[PDB]
């Protein structure tokens, strides 16, 4: 029943939004619908428009003394709020009708559709060495009044508000993730067998990862140490292909694997943000203004492979490293997903 609203600094132009967050069901997205409230006597000759834009923004917005974002406009949409447009698309919405009931004549609804080929709201962790905020893709709604679309923007006229787009976990479990690797010697037939498995393929933040690793060291070398870690992969694509990978959680056990022996164990690794408050380049979930959040939720690609290289893509993997004596170190990897469940 409650309804958010934002107003112009002059107090004359006000916009109402019923929701702050939107979700996608891998086939459709919740439409962005709202109503702008304004008395036409203030303008009496201008026209009101509301614009949807998504940009690759860097830095902060509080008049920092530094070169600001490389403002790449990934996608921009415009709608004519005033003068009134025809009925589509397609009808007015229920909440817009209720708000028009609440206000009356000066209520003007608008409709928008979000294309399916858009990235998710993510924000990179700013570094203490740097200043202000950091780079990150964000959504933004902008409403303004002017006689022309190309008229100069005014602080008193234009109003800026920030919205978010997030995904939620599907209810269908996937195949069981497992991996194996057998490495022999240079000449002798003796080999080194290792197998890694996980309880599930989809987990939840704060839930420990019970990795099941089995080592069949039917060889002559002795494994000195064992290292288990999870790696975060962040694909950066604006006009070139890039990927910045940073370790997030590492666990080491002082276990010796004797030659011609089989050793299997289950280890616990937990990703958390407390220990990485200073690590630059970390990817985090989209924030409102500056509020803290958890780690960046693993966004899942749609069924269509297409391109979808229009922003930041994130994925997680787990690697286990065996410290074999006199070289011969062998490591195995396993991809997995980790992102929020569906609320009610």
């Amino acid at each position, epitope marked *: 029943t*409650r309804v958010f609203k934002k107003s112009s600094p002059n107090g004359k132009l006000t916009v109402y939004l019923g929701k702050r967050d939107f979700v996608d069901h891998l086939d459709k997205v919740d439409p962005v619908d709202g109503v702008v409230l304004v008395d036409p006597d203030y303008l009496k000759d201008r026209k009101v428009f509301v614009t949807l834009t998504v940009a690759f923004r860097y830095g902060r917005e509080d008049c920092d003394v530094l070169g600001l974002s490389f403002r790449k406009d990934l996608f921009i949409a415009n709608y004519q709020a005033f003068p009134p447009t025809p009925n589509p698309p397609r009808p007015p919405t229920r909440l817009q009708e209720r708000l028009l009931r609440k206000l009356g004549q000066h209520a003007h609804p608008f409709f928008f559709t979000i294309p399916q080929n858009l990235p998710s709201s993510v924000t990179l962790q700013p570094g203490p060495e740097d200043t202000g905020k950091a780079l990150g893709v964000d959504f933004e709604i902008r409403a303004f009044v002017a006689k022309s679309l190309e008229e100069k923007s005014h602080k008193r006229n234009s109003v800026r508000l920030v919205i978010r787009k997030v995904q939620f976990a599907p209810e269908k479990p996937g195949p069981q993730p497992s991996a194996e690797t057998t490495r022999h010697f240079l000449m002798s037939d003796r080999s080194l067998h290792l197998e890694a498995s996980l309880d599930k393929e989809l987990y*939840y*933040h*704060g*839930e*420990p990862l019970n990795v099941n690793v089995h080592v069949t060291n039917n060889s002559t070398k002795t494994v000195k140490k064992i290292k288990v870690s999870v790696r975060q992969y962040a694909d950066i694509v604006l006009f070139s292909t890039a990927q910045y990978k940073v370790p997030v959680a590492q666990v080491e056990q002082d276990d010796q694997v004797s030659p011609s022996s089989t050793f299997s164990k289950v280890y616990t690794i*937990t990703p*958390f*943000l*407390a*220990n990485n*408050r200073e690590k630059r380049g970390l990817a985090l979930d989209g924030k409102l203004k500056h509020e*803290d959040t*958890n780690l960046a939720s693993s966004t899942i690609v749609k069924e269509g492979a297409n391109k979808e290289v229009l922003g930041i893509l994130v994925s997680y993997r787990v690697k286990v490293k065996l410290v074999v004596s006199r070289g011969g170190d062998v490591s195995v990897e396993l991809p997995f997903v980790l992102m*929020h469940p569906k609320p009610h």
Partner: antibody
Amino acid sequence: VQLVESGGGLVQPGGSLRLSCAASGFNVYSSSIHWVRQAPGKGLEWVASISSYYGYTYYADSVKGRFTISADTSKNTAYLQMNSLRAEDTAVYYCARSRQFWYSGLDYWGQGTLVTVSS
Amino acid sequence: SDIQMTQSPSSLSASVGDRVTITCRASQSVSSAVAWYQQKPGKAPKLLIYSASSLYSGVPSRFSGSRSGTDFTLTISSLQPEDFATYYCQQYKYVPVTFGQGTKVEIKR
């Protein structure tokens, strides 16, 4: 899912004590631990809070510096230590858990232990 | 700063299946971060309504509430012969949390 705790007793005012509250059936990381005291004839009063995932600590205004909190992740147990006991700190103390993502109240509560301070 | 709590009424008595309403007041506006708790005498507290509108699982539907600005009201459909206890009003959108003054319920004769 169960909640257990121990460490109650009678301590002379001005001393110190250590209380424990083990957690089972869930995770310390995916939740937060809250401590609340209930004086005889008075309502429950929150004292401190811990957020292991965010690594933040909070205390009440009346127990700033006097009361400390701690938790070991391996054993899934939380420990709070209070110092410089006064006669007005006697109450029944409870340890409770709250869902981290996101906050929706205090769904589960421990049975609670009484704290008595006097000479 | 601290947010004042003003529960009303403090404690009254009624009969089985009666109209009972409990009102909560706050010195500062809070959107929806209001929770309702009930604690039987000598036992552990237990919540009934969280977010001021959501009914917790394993709870009879007779309990309900509503919000009007800073006014928070608890409504009970019919009084069970085991609901005679105290109730507390809680807000959790500001640090620190502030608790209610307790609303004991008793049977009249």
